[PDB]
Ligand binder design. Structure first.
Ligand SMILES: O=C(O)c1cc(O)c2c(c1)C(=O)c1cccc(O)c1C2=O
Ligand SMILES: O=C(O)c1cc(O)c2c(c1)C(=O)c1cccc(O)c1C2=O
Lengths: 9, 219, 211, 217, 203, 7
């Protein structure tokens, strides 16, 4: 679902 | 063994020290604060080492709580209010009319004041936040046992830091840890307030029905 | 009369959209559900005349009731079960394991059963759906009045139809409008179920705070 | 009005001529009274079985109050008028957490109620309709309650034909307000439940009633 | 010793045993609480807030410890073992899973103790964040006293596990949330609930 | 309900 997160990490 | 040195952790908190510049208002701080939320996580020692599969769960799992501690800790510096990462300090009357009036008091009585009463500091804040982040009970981790071991490593340093700085009182460590239940509960209630509002007012299911594109009565 | 809003037309719309772990299944069906509603809605007379903006509100506004209205009628063939657009049949036991036992039980007694009790039909069902669609209490309507008028047109036709087809049931027109409260209620009930499950959201919730 | 005469019902309705939420919490025991007298004087009600009669009452309690205050407020501009002689305001209401519910009522129920010159006979009949609700839980003879219902609206259709001839869609218009009443009735329960949960140690009401003083027995 | 673990232990031992439960839970909770060392020295009025306030958390902690013996199940005070199928079908699958993963299992892993458990229960009980307390501060000292004792026990009994004290304390956030979830569940079932709700108002 | 049934 939310991989916007995986982005910055 | 001062692995997970409180020194790094303090360093991390300040890094996000915010540059000197309703629900919706708070509606903007977390997401902008993914920025802060993400930078902050990177610096926790040993944190990035986690399989990124796992690292992601912690971030999503921590987050409300990780955010709350922050406005909580920042407000100690102020009287009768909460001040956000958007700057923006809030007051009871508004908060109450906005309806998070109930949530709002619990924060002051159960979170800030107690933080202030013990004269909590950034190192202590960071370790508490760090403790939340490495949350084992979190869902979907490949190496849970892995996270538990690192967590223990965090508080342990935590216990020790407390001893040097504040010698007169030996119960401070337990005292810091007891704030967590309060922190966790406040997190749940926020969620409770958030859903009701979505549910309470019109065309809910807009979000659950995922993104709106009915424009195509065109096709 | 029938000129302002004609059922034959309203009938055509329904016939047009007829399909050719339930919680799980319904959700998958979302892209498809979109087509049926908008497609069906467009065939309703005068719907397309309304500002594109209003049309969106109505559709999103009545999205839940319309679908529900639709799945209940279909279920009439079915005995003690619900039939989805998927063609999936749901049953009490299956439903109760899934926690929606409360809602499922209501749909049948409150809705499906009664519909069969009166031998509801497609023209009438379609008429009820339109009335739901043209809902003027929807927030943001650019002009609510257009809608009140359009809604008024449907009942006139509906009322009038009932008399031609059913002289012996002076009862019918009112009876139909009477299922609207049950129908509305079930929907909010569904919403309640949808939210609780997200919230007692095992794993991660607030996952939903997508910008 | 062959069996359920409209005339009786008007008699029936007529018989009963700081923060708002406590406004009703403290207040509604009083209208336990109003509600019961009102149900007494509807035509075939008293003749139903007791098991059945009470069910309708709990069942319709929600809406019947709402409908009633909805109607009384037409008399006023931009406000809600309580049975307690209390008049509530939006900016006020907006502050005890029911800002949303209060607006729906005015826009969804009152204004619409007002815009049609709804009158007490109408108010009464609608209320009668809700009361005799067939979908209620566990009636021994439900098909019975359904039957009473038909008679009420039937009279209702007729009265409408009388006082207001030019408008032939009024009867339907009236019936279409019921959904709004029903949705608003539930939303209220939602505010009521939330305030319980959010506000405090809530187990108590669920725990039945508090007596731990004999905690120290 | 201002608050002694031995006394705290005696209290647990003293109370070892769809719920028209609770006349019983009430008896167990108050009888246990009275033996906590400084509880009855409290304004009677405070004592009511505390018991009522922590009523949910205190029971939960209780069934969890009892349940460790059971395998993949929870044992109620009634002496009734509950299992997933039973539970998941009956609408509380969500809670049951957490209770085991978040609570029972951890307690099992550490061979948590009656003293340790009783001690954890006391901390919960002497909750100073409780609304309405006559004076909150007095309660904090009582809470503060319990952890000190608890701290001491772990070292003496478990020198190798320097980590034991926090580990025990760290179960509280889990126990707390489970409580709120139970409440969220109790509330939903009533709301959803059959026939009419809000019947519930006791006038 | 007993309270209710006083009519
Ligand atoms: O088949 C059933 O009885 C049934 C059960 C449910 O829980 C839902 C539905 C149907 C929906 O149609 C629906 C639609 C939009 C949002 C929702 O949450 C739901 C439901 O939850
Ligand atoms: O075993 C379960 O799944 C379970 C589920 C629940 O909702 C509750 C409990 C257990 C309680 O033990 C309990 C105790 C005191 C007050 C309460 O509200 C509850 C609950 O609500």
């Amino acid at each position: 679902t939310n991989m916007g997160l995986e982005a910055i990490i | 063994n001062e692995d997970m040195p409180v020194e790094r952790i303090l360093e991390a908190e300040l890094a996000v020290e915010p540059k000197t510049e309703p629900v919706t208002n708070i509606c903007q701080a977390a997401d902008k604060q993914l920025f802060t939320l993400v930078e902050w996580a990177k610096r926790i020692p040993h944190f990035s080492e986690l399989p990124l599969d796992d690292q992601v769960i912690l971030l999503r799992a921590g987050w409300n709580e990780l955010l709350i501690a922050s406005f909580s800790h920042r407000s100690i510096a102020v009287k009768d209010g909460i001040l956000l990462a958007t700057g923006l300090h809030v007051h009871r009357n508004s908060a109450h009319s906005a309806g998070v009036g109930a949530i709002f008091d619990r924060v002051l009585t159960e979170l800030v004041s107690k933080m202030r009463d013990m004269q909590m500091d950034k190192t202590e804040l960071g370790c508490l936040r760090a403790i939340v982040l490495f949350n084992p009970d979190s869902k979907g981790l490949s190496n849970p046992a892995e996270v538990e071991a690192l967590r223990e490593k965090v508080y342990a340093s935590l216990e020790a830091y407390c001893k040097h700085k504040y010698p007169e009182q030996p119960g401070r460590f337990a005292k810091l840890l007891l704030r967590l239940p309060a922190l966790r509960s406040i997190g749940l209630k926020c969620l409770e307030h958030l859903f009701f509002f979505k549910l309470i007012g019109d065309t809910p299911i807009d979000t659950f029905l995922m993104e709106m594109l009915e424009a195509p009565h065109q096709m």
